[PDB]
Amino acid sequence: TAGRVVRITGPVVDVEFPRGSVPELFNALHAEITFGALAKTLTLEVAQHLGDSLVRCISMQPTDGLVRGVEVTDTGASISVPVGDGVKGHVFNALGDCLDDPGYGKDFEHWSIHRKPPAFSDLEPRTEMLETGLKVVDLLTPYVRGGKIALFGGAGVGKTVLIQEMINRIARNFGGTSVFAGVGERTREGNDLWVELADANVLKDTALVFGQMDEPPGTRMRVALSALTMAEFFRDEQGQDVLLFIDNIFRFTQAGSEVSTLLGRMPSAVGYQPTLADEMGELQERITSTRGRSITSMQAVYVPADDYTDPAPATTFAHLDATTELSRAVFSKGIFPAVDPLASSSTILDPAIVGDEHYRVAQEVIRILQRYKDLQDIIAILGIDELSEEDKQLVNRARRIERFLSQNMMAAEQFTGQPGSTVPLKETIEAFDKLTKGEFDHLPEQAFFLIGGLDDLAKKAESLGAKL
Template identity: 60%
Template sequence: MARAATQTSPAAGKVTQVIGAVVDVKFDGVLPPILNALETENGGHRLILEVAQHLGENVVRTIAMDSTEGLVRGQPVSDTGAPISVPVGDETLGRILNVIGEPVDELGPVTTTARRAIHQPAPEYVEQSTESQILVTGIKVVDLLAPYAKGGKIGLFGGAGVGKTVLIMELINNVAKAHGGYSVFAGVGERTREGNDLYHEMIESKVNVDPHENGGSAAGSKCALVYGQMNEPPGARARVALTGLTIAEDFRDKGQDVLFFVDNIFRFTQAGSEVSALLGRIPSAVGYQPTLATDMGALQERITTTNKGSITSVQAIYVPADDLTDPAPATSFAHLDATTVLNRSIAEKGIYPAVDPLDSTSRMLDPMVVGEEHYEVARKVQSTLQRYKSLQDIIAILGMDELSEDDKIAVARARKIERFLSQPFHVAEIFTGSPGKLVSLEDTIKGFKGLVNGDYDHMPEAAFYMVGSMDEAIEKAKKLAAVAA
């Protein structure tokens, strides 16, 4: 019978079958354990294979972390004796790494001996911290209606092209800059161009150090980047989120408050689904892998705050065909402290960020956490918007004139609230031509309190569109009045 290999005796085997990203390897007598990393040569490059199944007859089925083009049967493979491990610590800051921790930024090797396996158990219950503190983002709609928890998990849900990546970039801009601590960004199956843009934006905004001005070194940077983008094979996309998380966990365990950004969690699920079919598993609902909830749980349970430090995680989650009941986004809902749902119908009105104020939720919106005033204003804003939503069919059929006076006032206020929830972003300045605005929580609450109480009923709707605080809206109203006169 085959025995599992120990770390002292690295086993040697050979490739017996290659089907896309899945490679079968036969060993003579000693089998490497599940999740162990195997190593082979492919076109002069080191190729890592991760053991996924033991098939019997001394054969293991593995997932390739890079392209398998050029692999041939009979090729020698050696067991590394351990799971995939990646470099961790301060030396990773300012660097771009791939799924196996190799640098892809042409700045030479990562000079650290500290490494950590990408597969780790989640922290024990006794290690976890439960305090509730708000993370202020400077984005009105988020801070007012679905505030983020410091050390919590936040999901940005949206279909294609409604602004998930722009919102995550703005959060990096607002939070990572003001935060001053360390950040880790995991690019999972998204556009390489956006990854490149983000790297250069981080240098421009001084979050990271420009190595060309620093003698080829990125020392002094605040953010590590880990990429496994759209062009990578599914094995890399299924593991790159774990690589980024491993680097973030190391900072957390050293007492840091870390920001962990993932764009996009759906691609993690999608890659798992691609690999699952090749591994011979029978698909589950909508063609996803039968282990969907397990895979998601294994990742999400590790993203947590402990007594040593915190990980605040912001995850963009693509919603296929704008269907929130799709198993992939639906599975991630259960793990999140706050959900920010982006809606195409709001984007079509030209209101950005296109956050749905009625669909977005947060467990932090509780008077015990945010205070009585904030809670009351948020609930009034939501009830006004809900009333407008329920009257929209009547307005579409009969027009505004058929509404009662009370309803007319509610609709007018709701339309102003809708526009005041829009905000120009720093990262979108080049597209919009408007300078970005960061609004304090006090100004946000004050502005919306005045709106729901009717203090600004005399101002035109246009004054509230794409401004920061209420003072700017008042200024804009004066300018509009002057132009009209």
Template identity: 50%
Template sequence: MDAVFSEDDRPFLNEALLVDTGERRILFEAHQYINRETVRSISLGKTQGLRRGMEVRRTGRFVEVPVGEPMLGRVVNLLGEPMDGKGMIVSDLKFPIHRESPTLQSQIVQPEVYETGIKVIDLLSPFIRGGKVGLFGGAGVGKTVLLMEFIYKAVKVYAGVSVFAGVGERIREGHELYEEMKRTGVIDHTVIVLGQMNEPPGVRFRVSMTALSISEYFRDIKGRDVLLLMDNIFRFVQAGSEVSALLGRVPSRSGYQPTMFSEISEIEERITSTESGSITSVQAVYVPADDITDPAITAIMPHLDTVVILSRNIASKGLYPAVDPLRSRSKLLSPELVGVEHYEVARKVKETLSRYNELQDIIAMLGIDELTPEDRLLVSRARKLERFLTQPFFLTEPFTGKPGRHVALRDTIRGCRNILEGKYDDVDERKFYMIGTEREL
């Protein structure tokens, strides 16, 4: 929408603008100056009823959303308005969705392991408390299931607060998410913020900022440790591309908006630990056509402390979570930060799985009997490791009939070390599938 103001009363960029159609009020956000008097803005809601010549009013502030304890257990939209039919949210405090990232002096940079209780992640791609984690994968490899499991662990194990941002979510998925959270009993400690797939691009582009502001309240005012989950950050990039096209910007050669890097940075730089508390972010990242070299993917990756890549090939074998242990990585995985034992076991696990991967073609063409005795033993241990690193989730209990497992990191390290050292060479590999610790063998 283009609106004309007097030159001395021109809105500032990102200011919230208001149009009253008589039936409802529509909120816009100023994005671009066309000339000294004309401002181009992006709609933050449906535009039915909007007509040329309507009055546009300045608000003199950024878009603001309610924050605080009343938000827990609620499903809200970009503006913090309820979507769950539970009535209005009464909160005395509001935060703008545009906020400065914490100063360098107030940030805490001492890395600390955030245990998830998921073996393959804790061992090979450990999370950093107050860090940023990306779950990369194509459609149908388990990104959302993993996110839901993290919410369950954050509430049940750490007694923390979770904020879920559904960026470009399908309406069906948003409903399923809400019902699943009610079933598992985590909804009372969670805020769900949805900018659904049918919403205008401005809504999908800004909904992650609403979730961030709510998270910052619990971190800065309440001193809580917050788990912020975004599904899907790639949809944020797509929405930014649509907004960029509406503003008339020329796309880059790759087809994305020229401001993509700065838009991603604006989100990522606000996610950090401070002296008050921490925000640990887990972001699902859809990989278009399974192309990990896509410009949007490569723009997101440098901001992340941990990269977890979900593999369609591993999922096809029935190995869940379908984490690719050789392509996933974490900045935390060094002997100085996780300890020598953890680092050495993780390194040997990766070496064993890498060598097994190299032998796959020989096994496929000639059979396993053509391998040397040493390689046959390595293959046997690698297959046991693959299966030991699977585990049942609490979220999937109703579908699999297997109770979920939360496995302590020390138990994961001990189990993998014993497999590598040959303690279980005589045990059938099938017994390692979907168990928690080695004590279940």
């Protein structure tokens, strides 16, 4: 009842089985590579039924050294990962193998990494602010507790530093458990996160799953499912509040695109897989809070070539309750976090949820920034000296506002040696209310740059010779 490899095309393997023993879709098959340096056991995942008892499978490990005709065995079940309280404090790969302690977790209960999302009748919308202490996030894009937050950004604009910032701000003072999913990112970043969580004592509450850049596309597109399976066990089987950090989900999409190319599928727009929205939706709909069971998920989303129109982030947008878009233009200004206040959004930034004062201040800030953006065209050529008096006043106010939205982050100290700051939501609302009213028009712009609340503004303005 064993199969045999008939075709090998990179990470994709075609296996012929005896009639009547064709494995089911997503079944995990096993093959052997015997060549010395590359000797290993390949785990393949049945992806297609090609007909004539052939199945096309995706290899989780590289296929180098695989020979046609070697026998392929069927496990009878899909890939499964260990679940339970024992996965906390340990590092796993996409297949559930423990890296910090090989052999650990083999005795745990094992859950298939493929399952349907929660039934529609179990879904209840989440509208509850999750305060972070970041002025821009709390004011303009409030995060939802038990909801879905995404961090969109191009290369090097600060997605990972902001993920570390949110781990610091949210995960440390967190009652429940955390799951981190390194999806196709730097391995040394995973090592740094592991060490930092160990130092901060958060590791004992966290399960880390890593399929990083130096992996075949199958692993890079299944590691997210493995981490989500652990998070789902924590949500469903223990009623724990779960923190889910994914970095980076675009890597899951990109791995899917590579696999689709290897599977002989017809390319879609921009060369992406035809089932881009389908795969993205399956994965994302599994990531959710159900009635009485909370998953606060935060995902970094890489944006190729800084093109926010790319199909991958464009499809990702729909699955989110809060979206923090990081801009190259803001980053170039030295503003951290490099949040684009106009492009970013939150589903709970409405008067009914955050209150009339918070909403009013946020809307006024957005209006001022939008007017500044509109004036950019004139300003680029002629400076601010050709604008009306109202426009000059508004532009100075907008510059101060956009500098004040920046902040000295907790996770930025390693870069600057400057300890981070946390601003209460009420202080943030009051400060931006005053700033929109023009009460700080006399202070120099730099006084607003990379500081905390109003007290820090006063101290910095004093240091610069200005008086508040």
